[PDB]
RNA sequence: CCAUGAUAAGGAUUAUAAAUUGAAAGUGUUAAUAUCAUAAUCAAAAUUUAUUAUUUAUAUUAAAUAUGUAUGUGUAGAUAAAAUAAGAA
């Protein structure tokens, strides 16, 4: 059960059908979907000639960003500079402490797994743990 | 058991008029005798309230690039702000400054009365950005911090009425306000001419006119921001005699006299 | 007072003699009992006077048709030319 | 702090509180001009005699 | 109101036709020009000023001017009407009672009391003031005249 | 000659359209020759059937006549 | 508009919106209308000029009636000026025949 | 503020004003953003005047200017949430919880039609109404007819 | 098939005429058009759904262009797109606000003109009436919350609240 | 006539983007490539937003 | 009902109640109104007249011969809405 | 009969009929119902069909009366002209302004012929006015048919009402999507309009005044739109839109790419110089040959210069076929040589070049840039030209054009 | 105005009387731009340009803003430094350092 | 050099012709949000003419 | 003091919340917009002088 | 949190006839009880939750970014829908 302010304000109204590609809250759970032949044409800008998004650059006289935007595309300088790179994700943040050259040119949201396979055994309740065991997700 | 959102406030008029004006009762609003607006806030409180107006890309938001806190607690997990120097290493620095935000007058009409790209809508009338001082909009000092409370935001105090007033603007509202607050006639009776910045354009127009390039002369005339002098109009009118362009001469005379303070009444 | 306009009261109609006695399926208020009970072979399958639909307008907020010229029903021959075959123009 | 002359209670000392914005007939709020410096019979007191002024 | 004042609306048409014909405007006498300018200021609003004459501040300033001059008998916002006129009991069939189906703001000289059943001139002899009862009306004339 | 009005489709090779053509031809023949009306009326050629396809309704699963799943 | 959006702050911008919506200025001119004698003694437009004009204006002409819908400016006064200018330009380019 | 002497019954009604302001910002920025986007990613030469380096350098500079434009209204219209102006209830366009003509939610529409607050006419629930275009082709046909009435009717100059 | 389109000059022709490409260039001079060089010659498709009278949705105009890759980012779309200025969005962003009375005119100005002073909203009146009706019976439930606590914490010299 | 009169002289555009020419001369911009060395090997791979 | 008011111009129930005109009844103007003719207010503008001279006028009018004769001297003296900046002692 | 047609012919007919919707010349000279000088369409819109029908009837009656009075005034005015009148010298000049009539020479229309043309026009206008008056008098309370033009004026036509069906949920459930969809309801907004068509054989501002002022007294909840189709005389002249030959170098597709409407094209018409400067080795015939005009017409255009002197500015005749275009395509280059006693070898400062070229220093910097980049200026208030500057180019504003460099 | 049996007796006129027509017509002024008189030719050169405050504004599609686009290009090229703008890269340039930049 | 519309059927489906994947965008109809959300600025007739 | 300035709005109460009575008069479409076309006394005196 | 009322879904007996196969008994948001309450989209986001028709084996990723998963004898239990331009006695 996701806990957020909008959860009380809005209502799911069951498994309602939305217009194609027009769900209100976008949750790209398929960003980390791997596809070798379609590596450059999945969750990425369609044209190779397009410039990098505005989110990859600093515009004004900034004082500092806690985390960079997900659409910011990983570049060589991200690994070469050896600086601190963080991306907001559940639960709190994901930090790039393993700079690799195999992710150059791909978006950080594509690199980061949205739906983490790991399940917390601590906050899980008795009934919820029983449900997970019945589903097979937990022993 | 007294609670207050703001623990200190300041008055509007200083100690030269209120001491005498206090003897005259003021008919305050019956159902709310005590009022406390944004122009009555202290400096720090007003700054921190105006920072929170913008949804994002503003000082109030914890991660917008303009924050000042050393650390931010996120989901019971502390995080440290990456400084600008460390960001610069892998984020290329592109920055023009206040000049990028502002747009030219000729593009103001296409941008629908807005010469500023700032995310707070700037209105040139002296009533929307109404702090204690009248609302005056700067052009080369536009910044995200915006020390002068001249912009319009939809989260600060006593903003609903200003939002309604902005939405009820008439046609040519901002354009008319800009014109009437920038091209006002001088008190001494002299026309608002002899502007130092606009002077070369007049000479260029005069040269093109005397060279008989009336089309290019008008194409450069439309770029004039202030009111051109009578020399421009007399040259443009005298250009139409060889070509018998009475239509264009009449149009020039109308644009000169009917609108711009009867400059072409010569 | 702007509400002084919404002040005029009305009066109920004046009845005579006793009250209409009912008959000594849920009793539906909308349906008129005796009129509906009356045979269709006599009363005809009509819910309105037989007048051209041009004179009838579908009302608002009421599930019935009303007439713009109230009670003044022009016959069919009024619209048609004099002595018209099948009321054709 | 709160006071009997600052709270909104409808009745004070058994009489209708005159300190409530909602405790006055709306015609009182209508704008009017001071007339104490005018003539004695031109003041608002002689409303029924105003039509007979010379 | 007098209906012949509409004839001044033709003046801008005549001025435009004079512009087309080449008749000078200034050659008119100044006495005539004063009234011509009056009719122009009454029936010659430009488009630029038409884009703004419909607002709130201007209408409420006109309301304030009317209040200051003491003439509010012909303003939609500031005039509330209390008098009502009841139905007529037709003698054809007095059993049926009549109910109102609409409401109109008739100027009250359409349906006046005929003179012969009226007190003499009803103006100087009697002074009538339409005030409001302070007691609970419970239904009736809230605004009654004395 | 037959002129199609209303909703036009590429191929109208269906029994409903054939019935419409039959009714149109019968009415034209009746208008042309008066005494032809009796056989056609007694055989039902001129009679019109008021049946029509149920209109769309998004509440239905398909939109016409099938409700949604119930538990 | 008189039903609503009048007499108050609505009217100021509603009138402008209506005028911008109705900025269109149609200009119609028959092809046979132009087929007269010019002041120089030659016919203004001949069959060849008409054919060239028809080729130049694919859909702007129809049933021998050239039509141009000037929609460039909000003001009809400026839109008619633009329409006349474009019509004269098209006619001049068609007169090459 | 902080629910001290609130005048409006619902706090969320101010989000309607915020949405109107964001629409006005879109009105301001819709031309500049579109022009910058068009210039930035046009590979073909613009004209004889600008070709090669004179064009690519200009594209880079205009893209830099667009990025430096602080507060530009990037967000599209379909991703902006629609909130009723009467009861501050959110509805998403394209579903049945929002009506396009009245710009109010399904609940507000039902309340207003059930009371007397909006002059509407009743039609059959499982039909195509009374409009000829809706009977003919439906939603897409009436949409195309609106397009034809607006733009395709005019022989543009 | 694949071919190179030739262009025979009228001067080189046995008898000169006006070439169709020359006339089209004149047309582009007249009306400022765009000649898409990369437009293929094999993709000229007619929208038969809306261009053929066979279908019930026939309208006579090419309502849509048959191009699956036609999106919105491309400058071809951008150039011929319609700006939202003065449109139904312009109408909605101004007419649709919570208070239609405030849309028509300022509430404070309207009250100061027709009435005496500014009148509070019905909700505020409800709050004031409930407070009036509940303070008479008891004075324990209420508390003191104000925007500016400075005046309450430092009352003027001659402020003595009446004991109750 | 040599050229069409309605055409615009290139000096107008030069005066328009005068700063661009000066900056190009200062920074010695010989050429700005837009494709890699062997982009022509794979035609469907790149597909610039004009084709 | 409720805190939110009901606008009578948009609400058809108020417009079709017994206190207004029903749609079945004929739609026609009733009691034509003349407000701008019975008592017309003078034009008082909140903003000052923008085209006002805003100065003292001297009504300079001399014989044309003398004016053209003194034209070389009068160029330094102020003209209509034109003020040369010549030194006053000159 | 029976009809059998080709599919392509059917398709072409249908699409042509659909497209040719507004291609109708409403105002013609044909005699009868069709044929008028101005046309007015009052599209009156309301909520109810009977509302708009009754409003259309009322407005039709009002317009019938007003138009009858206007047309009768026009008739009693035109019968005076038909009885007798005079032709103005302006009209005579208009009729005799042609250089060559259809008969190959100058035509001399006299008073009698001009009056005959005027009288024919007045007769046609009178017959149209009489037709309008008769159609206005035709309607009667016994039988009033306003939906046909023959028996009514102005005749009233119909228009398809705007009907919009809004489909929305009615349930307030926040869980059951099936229930929400099954609770769907349809309610539609309707706007009914009626169109009133008036065809006046003349343009009168009085009728427009009486027509635009009916929105004040329109019925309840009804608006109106005024479509106006009026004949207007437009002037086409070769002075500003000439018919010249195609350029020697034809424009290609490269000049019509994207953004070419602004990058390399200016708004028509392109300016052509109407003034010229005469050289020393010239005469009246020489300048006439240079400008491609008659010497007599050039002399008449000048109208004040009996003699031609070297370095004199004259006015180019408006009908000249070789009029120069402003800002000729040949760039102007300022030579480095002083051609004076200032330095004797090269221009030193930029102010000197600005004075020579009569242009601003900022424009001089912008035109080339190279001099600004390589400017060998000392920071101690000393600016000098770079020794590597091969040439100095003049700004576009100072360019000049000549026939030799502008014509092939 | 002499109709005593008005409203009360069910009399509502079908046609608005001439007196009321004249009253309503005389109450409001006439727009001076509705005369649309024209005597001189169109101004090809100066009418479109005019003055910025009352400039003839193109509306709608971007292609109609030819002058506005020209001014925007001039402003952006005169404000944005190339040294700052050169730092913008392209996707192919960035991906050229990938171990598999092209397949 | 350019091609002509293919005479044969096989090349039409064997050529590199993609298919629609995302939402369909029209140069003008994008103002009207969807066929269901038909945004009409004014309640004018669908058969209305502008002369 | 003026006898025409009366109470347009009712005394505050719960009827304004619990009843559907509108709080303002619906707009009168036939009554025209108020515009300024008058002459002041000093202006008339100056004209006569 | 609580802080009165109000619209939904739910077919079993008034039928042919010049006719409609969707109900009033109530569904989150709406008008009197108070007494720390700043929880609200303007993008790029976090399945554990009853109430939801998905494309099945010739040709398969181009424009806002848009689904990598489960081939297994049309296969247990349990369960859904339709007698209206369709074809059922």
Automatic annotation (TrEMBL), chain F:
Coiled coil regions, renumbered to chain: none
Protein name: Ribosomal protein S9
Record organism: Trypanosoma brucei brucei (strain 927/4 GUTat10.1)
Entire protein: shown range: 371 to 441 of 443
UniProtKB/TrEMBL annotation, chain G:
Domain of life: Eukaryota
UniProt name for this protein: Uncharacterized protein
UniProt organism field: Trypanosoma brucei brucei (strain 927/4 GUTat10.1)
Source taxonomy: Eukaryota, Discoba, Euglenozoa, Kinetoplastea, Metakinetoplastina
From TrEMBL, chain J:
Shown part of the complete sequence: 665 to 715 of 817
Record's protein name: LysM domain-containing protein
TrEMBL record, chain O:
Superkingdom field: Eukaryota
Protein's name according to its UniProt entry: Pentacotripeptide-repeat region of PRORP domain-containing protein
């Amino acid at each position: 059960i996701a806990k957020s302010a909008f959860g009380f304000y809005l209502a799911r109204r069951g498994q309602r059908k939305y217009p194609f590609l027009r769900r209100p809250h976008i949750k790209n759970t398929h960003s980390m979907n791997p596809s070798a032949p379609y590596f450059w044409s999945f969750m990425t800008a369609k044209s190779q000639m397009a410039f990098l998004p505005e989110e990859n650059y600093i515009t004004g006289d900034w004082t500092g960003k806690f985390f960079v935007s997900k659409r910011q595309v990983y570049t060589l300088q991200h690994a070469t500079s050896g600086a601190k790179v963080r991306v907001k994700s559940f639960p709190s943040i994901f930090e790039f402490n393993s700079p690799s050259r195999w992710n150059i040119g791909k978006e950080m949201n594509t690199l980061t797994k949205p739906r983490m396979d790991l399940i917390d055994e601590q906050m899980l309740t008795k009934k919820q743990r029983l449900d997970y065991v019945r589903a097979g997700l937990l022993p | 058991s007294v609670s207050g959102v703001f623990s200190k406030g300041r008055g509007i008029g200083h100690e030269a008029t209120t001491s005498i004006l206090r003897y005259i009762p003021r008919a305050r609003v019956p159902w709310q005798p005590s009022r406390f607006g944004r122009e009555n806030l202290t400096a720090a409180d007003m700054a921190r309230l105006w920072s929170r107006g913008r949804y994002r890309d503003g000082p109030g938001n914890y991660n917008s690039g303009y924050c000042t806190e050393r650390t931010h607690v996120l989901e019971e997990n502390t995080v440290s702000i990456i400084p600008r120097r460390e960001l610069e290493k892998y984020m290329p620095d592109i920055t023009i400054g206040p000049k990028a935000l502002v747009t030219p007058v000729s593009l103001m009409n296409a941008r629908n009365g807005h010469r500023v790209t700032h995310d707070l809508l700037h209105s040139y009338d002296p009533h929307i950005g109404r702090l204690g001082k009248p609302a005056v909009v700067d052009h080369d000092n536009i910044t995200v911090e915006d020390p002068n409370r001249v912009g319009l935001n939809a989260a600060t105090l006593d903003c609903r009425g200003r939002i309604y007033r902005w939405l009820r603007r008439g046609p040519f509202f901002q354009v008319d306000n800009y014109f009437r607050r920038s091209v006002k006639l001088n008190r001494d009776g002299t026309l608002p001419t002899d502007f130092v910045h606009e002077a070369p354009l007049m000479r260029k127009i005069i040269r093109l006119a005397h060279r008989g390039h009336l089309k290019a002369a008008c194409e450069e005339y439309r770029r004039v921001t202030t009111v051109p002098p009578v020399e421009v109009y007399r040259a443009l009118t005298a250009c139409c005699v060889p070509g018998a362009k009475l239509a264009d001469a009449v149009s020039i005379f109308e644009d000169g006299d009917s609108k711009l303070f009867y400059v072409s009444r010569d | 007072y702007y509400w002084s306009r919404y002040r005029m009261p009305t009066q109920m109609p004046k009845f005579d003699g006793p009250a209409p006695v009912a008959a000594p399926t849920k009793t539906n208020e909308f349906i008129d009992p005796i009129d509906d009970k009356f045979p269709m072979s006599i009363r005809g399958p009509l819910v309105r006077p037989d007048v051209p639909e041009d004179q009838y307008v579908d009302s608002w907020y009421i599930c019935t048709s009303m007439t713009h010229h109230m009670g003044d029903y022009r016959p069919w021959s009024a619209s048609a030319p004099p002595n018209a075959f099948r009321f054709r123009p | 702090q709160a006071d009997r002359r600052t709270r909104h209670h409808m009745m004070v000392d058994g009489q209708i509180n005159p300190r409530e914005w909602f405790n006055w007939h709306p015609k009182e709020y209508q704008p009017w001009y001071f007339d104490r410096h005018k003539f004695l019979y031109e003041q608002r007191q002689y409303a029924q005699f105003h039509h007979l002024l010379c | 109101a007098n209906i012949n004042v509409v004839e001044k609306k033709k003046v801008p048409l005549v001025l435009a036709q004079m512009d087309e014909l080449g008749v000078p405007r200034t050659h008119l006498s100044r006495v005539l020009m004063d009234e011509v300018e009056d009719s122009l200021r009454k029936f010659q609003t430009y488009r630029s000023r038409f884009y703004e004459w419909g607002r709130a501040v201007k209408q409420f300033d006109f309301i304030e001017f009317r209040r200051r001059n003491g003439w509010l008998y012909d303003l939609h916002l500031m005039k509330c009407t209390t008098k009502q006129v009841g139905p007529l009991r037709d003698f054809n069939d007095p059993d049926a009672v009549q109910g109102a189906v609409a409401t109109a703001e008739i100027p009250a000289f359409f349906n006046e009391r005929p003179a012969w059943e009226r007190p003499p001139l009803e103006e100087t002899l009697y002074v009538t003031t339409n005030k409001e009862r302070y007691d609970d009306v419970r239904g009736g004339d809230i605004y009654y005249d004395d | 000659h037959i002129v199609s009005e209303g909703h036009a489709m590429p191929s109208i090779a269906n029994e409903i359209a054939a019935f419409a053509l039959r009714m149109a031809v019968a009415n034209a023949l009746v208008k042309l020759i008066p005494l032809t009306r009796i056989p056609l009326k007694k055989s039902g050629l001129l009679s019109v059937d008021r049946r029509r396809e149920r209109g769309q309704f998004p509440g239905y699963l398909d939109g016409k006549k099938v409700k949604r799943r119930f538990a | 508009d008189n039903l609503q959006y009048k007499r108050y702050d609505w009217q100021g911008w509603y009138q402008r919106m209506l005028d911008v919506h109705n900025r269109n200025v149609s200009l119609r001119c028959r092809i046979c209308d132009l087929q007269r004698l010019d002041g120089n003694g030659v016919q203004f437009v001949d069959m060849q000029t008409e054919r060239r004009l028809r080729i130049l204006a694919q859909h702007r002409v129809g049933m021998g009636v050239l039509k141009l819908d000037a929609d460039k400016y909000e003001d009809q006064a400026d839109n008619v000026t633009f329409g006349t200018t474009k019509l004269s330009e098209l006619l001049a380019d068609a007169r090459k025949a | 503020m902080r629910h001290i002497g609130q005048d409006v019954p619902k706090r969320h009604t101010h989000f309607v004003l915020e949405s109107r302001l964001m629409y006005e910002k879109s009105f301001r920025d819709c031309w500049l953003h579109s022009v910058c986007r068009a210039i930035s990613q046009l590979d073909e030469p613009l004209s004889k005047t600008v070709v090669g380096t004179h064009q690519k350098m200009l594209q880079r500079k205009v893209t830099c200017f667009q990025y430096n434009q602080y507060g530009l209204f990037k967000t599209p219209y379909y991703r902006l949430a629609n909130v009723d102006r009467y009861h501050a209830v959110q509805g998403v366009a394209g579903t049945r919880e929002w009506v396009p003509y009245v710009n109010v939610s399904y609940w507000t529409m039902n309340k207003m039609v059930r009371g007397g607050n909006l002059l509407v006419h009743r039609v059959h629930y499982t039909g195509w109404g009374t409009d000829s275009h809706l009977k003919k082709g439906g939603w897409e046909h009436r949409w195309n007819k609106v397009l034809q009435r607006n733009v395709l009717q005019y022989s543009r100059i | 098939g694949v071919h190179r389109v030739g262009y025979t000059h009228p001067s080189t022709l046995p008898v000169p005429c006006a070439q169709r490409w020359d006339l089209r260039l004149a047309r582009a001079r007249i009306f400022q058009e765009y000649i898409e060089e990369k437009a293929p010659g094999a993709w000229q498709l007619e929208d038969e759904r809306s261009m053929s009278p066979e279908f019930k949705t026939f309208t006579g105009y090419p309502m849509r262009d048959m191009r699956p890759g036609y999106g919105q980012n491309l400058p071809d779309y951008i150039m011929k797109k319609r700006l939202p200025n003065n449109t139904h969005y312009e109408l909605f962003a101004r007419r649709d606000i919570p208070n239609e009375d405030n849309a028509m005119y300022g509430k404070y100005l309207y009250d100061m003109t027709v009435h005496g002073t500014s009148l509070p909203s019905t909700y505020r009146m409800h709050k004031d009436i409930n407070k009036a009706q509940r303070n008479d019976r008891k004075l324990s439930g209420n508390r003191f919350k104000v925007l500016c606590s400075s005046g309450a914490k430092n009352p003027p010299s001659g402020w003595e609240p009446i004991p109750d | 006539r040599l050229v069409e009169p309605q055409l615009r002289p290139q000096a107008a555009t030069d005066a328009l983007l005068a700063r661009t020419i000066a900056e190009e001369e200062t920074f010695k911009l010989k050429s700005i490539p837009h494709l890699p060395q062997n982009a022509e090997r794979f035609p469907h791979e790149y597909h610039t937003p004009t084709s | 009902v409720g805190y939110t008011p009901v606008n009578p111009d948009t609400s058809p129930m108020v417009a079709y109640s017994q206190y207004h005109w029903h749609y079945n009844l004929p739609q026609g103007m009733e009691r034509p109104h003349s407000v701008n003719r019975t008592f017309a207010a003078p034009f008082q503008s909140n903003h000052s007249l923008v085209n006002k001279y805003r100065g003292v006028w001297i009504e300079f009018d001399m014989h044309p011969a003398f004016s053209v004769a003194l034209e070389p001297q009068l160029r330094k003296l102020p003209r209509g809405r034109t003020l040369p900046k010549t030194p006053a002692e000159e | 009969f029976p009809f059998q047609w080709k599919t392509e012919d059917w398709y072409e007919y249908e699409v042509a009929k659909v497209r040719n919707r507004r291609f109708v010349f409403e105002n013609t000279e044909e005699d009868g119902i069709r044929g008028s000088e101005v046309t007015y369409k009052i599209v009156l819109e309301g909520f109810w069909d009977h509302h708009v029908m009754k409003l259309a009837e009322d407005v039709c009656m009002f317009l019938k009366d007003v138009g009858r009075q206007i047309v009768e005034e026009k008739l009693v005015a035109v019968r005076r002209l038909l009885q007798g009148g005079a032709v103005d010298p302006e009209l005579l000049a208009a009729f005799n302004c042609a250089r060559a009539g259809p008969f190959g020479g100058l035509d001399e229309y006299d008073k009698e012929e001009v009056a005959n043309f005027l009288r024919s026009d007045l007769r046609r206008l009178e017959e149209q006015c009489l037709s309008v008056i008769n159609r206005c008098n035709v309607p009667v309370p016994g039988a009033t048919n306003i939906y046909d033009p023959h028996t009514s004026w102005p005749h009233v036509e119909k228009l398809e009402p705007w009907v919009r069906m809004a489909e929305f949920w009615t349930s307030s459930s926040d869980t059951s999507f099936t229930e929400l969809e099954m609770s769907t309801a349809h309610y539609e907004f309707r706007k009914f309009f009626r169109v009133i068509i008036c065809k006046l054989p003349f343009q009168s501002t009085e009728f427009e005044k009486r027509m635009y002022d009916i929105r004040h007294w329109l019925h309840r909840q009804t608006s109106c739109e005024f479509h106006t189709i009026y004949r207007r005389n437009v002037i086409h002249d070769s002075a500003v839109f000439p018919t010249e030959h195609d350029p020697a170098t034809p424009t290609t597709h490269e000049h019509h790419r994207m953004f070419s409407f602004a990058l390399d094209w200016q708004s028509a018409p392109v300016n052509r110089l109407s003034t010229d400067t005469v050289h020393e080795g010239e005469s009246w015939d020489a300048v006439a040959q240079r400008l491609g005009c008659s010497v007599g017409e050039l002399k008449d255009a000048n109208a004040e210069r009996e003699t031609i002197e070297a370095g004199v500015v004259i006015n180019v005749p408006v009908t000249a076929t070789r009029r120069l275009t402003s800002f000729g395509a040949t760039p102007l280059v300022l030579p480095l040589k002083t051609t004076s006693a200032k330095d004797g070898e090269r221009i030193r400062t930029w102010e000197e070049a600005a004075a020579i070229l009569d242009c601003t220093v900022e424009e001089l910097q912008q035109c080339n840039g190279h001099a600004a980049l390589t400017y060998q200026k000392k920071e101690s208030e000393a600016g000098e030209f770079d020794s590597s500057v091969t040439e100095l180019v003049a700004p576009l504003s100072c360019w000049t054009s000549t026939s030799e460099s502008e014509f092939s | 105005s002499h109709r005593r049996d008005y409203i009360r007796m069910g009399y509502i006129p079908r046609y608005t009387p001439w007196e009321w027509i004249a009253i309503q017509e005389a109450d409001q002024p006439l727009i001076a731009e509705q005369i649309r008189q024209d005597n001189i030719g169109t101004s090809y050169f100066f009418s479109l340009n005019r003055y910025w405050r009352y400039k003839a504004s193109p509306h709608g599609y971007i292609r109609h803003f030819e002058n506005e686009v020209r001014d925007l290009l001039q402003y952006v090229d005169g404000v944005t430094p190339w040294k700052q703008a050169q730092k913008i890269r392209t996707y192919w340039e960035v991906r050229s350092h990938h171990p598999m930049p092209q397949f | 050099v350019d091609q002509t519309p293919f005479e044969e059927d096989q090349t039409w489906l064997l050529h590199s012709i993609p298919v629609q994947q995302l939402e369909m965008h029209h140069h003008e109809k994008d103002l009207q949000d969807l066929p269901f959300i038909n945004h009409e600025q004014f309640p004018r007739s669908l058969e209305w003419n502008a002369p | 003091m003026l006898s025409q300035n009366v109470a347009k709005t009712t005394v505050p109460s719960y009827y304004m919340i619990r009843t559907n009575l509108p709080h303002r008069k619906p707009q009168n479409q036939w009554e025209g917009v108020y515009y300024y076309s008058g002459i002041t006394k000093r202006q008339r005196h100056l004209i006569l002088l």
